Amino acid sequence: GCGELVWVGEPLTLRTAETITGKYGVWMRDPKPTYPYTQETTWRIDTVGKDVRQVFEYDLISQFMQGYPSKVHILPRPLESTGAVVYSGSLYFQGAESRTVIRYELNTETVKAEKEIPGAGYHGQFPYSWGGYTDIDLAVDEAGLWVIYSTDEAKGAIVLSKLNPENLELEQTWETNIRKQSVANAFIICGTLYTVSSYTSADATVNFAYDTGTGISKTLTIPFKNRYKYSSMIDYNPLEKKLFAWDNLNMVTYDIKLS
Ligand SMILES: [Ca+2]
Ligand code: NA
């Protein structure tokens, strides 16, 4: 069932990167797995550097946690930052030094669609507060695929658009009043965008909400712990109903509760 976020659990570390290449990154599972993948399949991208192309794929959670990848994909174009997601068999990622979102079908290693996010800032215009070229952040929730960004028209306030997952068309767009550069990251649960106050503090909070169904913005004070003091990626997985994050080399997951 769906509801408002009311609680976040303690971060649990599932894997720790062993080199500086993985100081920041993105790891994820597919909330709508398709053959040959399952809900155990995990993908990991270590995103430090300027030619990020390697995507580590693990058939089993045990392999993700303790072993080597079962497959490495080499993306056909370098990827930007930590905002990518996997949805219904495709990796959705942002091309380096662009506002282009790319749909890369994992089982065939084929680019199926590319879309400029209209008006979106990129490459350090509207990052989250830590920087990292985090201008464009994809998200999956119970209703499918979204993108979080900003524009000059929005004066840097978070904008979110629902995306067609097949062709990347924008279906609907909402504008919040939350300065994107003022929050550490964001994610969407049940159609509500939530933000995190700090990427360094052990005593951060989920501090704002914007409900796309009602247009209402709220403040919140839900505790959120950055166990390792540098969270570069915070996303929601609607199948597991958990937050997935990357915090200073560590791939972590948080339980949640909804009303
Ligand atoms: Ca996010
Ligand atoms: Na994302």
Residue numbers in the entry: 244 to 502
Excerpt from the publication:
At the outset of our study, five variants could be confidently predicted as benign polymorphisms: T293K, T353I, K398R, A445V and K500R. These mutations are all found on the protein surface and well documented in the literature. Thr to Lys and Thr to Ile are less conservative changes, but in prior studies, T293K and T353I exhibited wild type (WT)-like cellular secretion and WT-like thermal stability, and were found in the control group for case–control clinical studies. Modestly lower levels than WT were detected for T293K, E352K, K398R, N420Y and A427T. Structural integrity was further confirmed by high-resolution crystal structures, which were solved for 11 OLF variants. No gross changes from WT OLF were detected for the structures of T293K, R296H, L303I, V329M, S331L, E352K, T353I, K398R, A445V, V449I or K500R, indicating that these mutations are accommodated within the native five-bladed β-propeller fold and do not perturb the dinuclear calcium-containing site.
Inherited missense mutations in the myocilin (MYOC) gene, within its olfactomedin (OLF) domain, constitute the strongest genetic link to primary open-angle glaucoma via a toxic gain of function, and thus MYOC is an attractive precision-medicine target. Myocilin has no known function, and there is no glaucoma phenotype in Myoc knockout mice or in individuals with a homozygous N-terminal truncation mutation or hemizygous deletion of MYOC, but rare non-synonymous coding mutations lead to toxic intracellular sequestration of misfolded myocilin. However, not all mutations in MYOC cause glaucoma, and common variants are expected to be neutral polymorphisms. Among the common features associated with pathogenic myocilin misfolding, we demonstrate that a single metric, OLF thermal stability, can robustly segregate benign from early-onset disease variants.
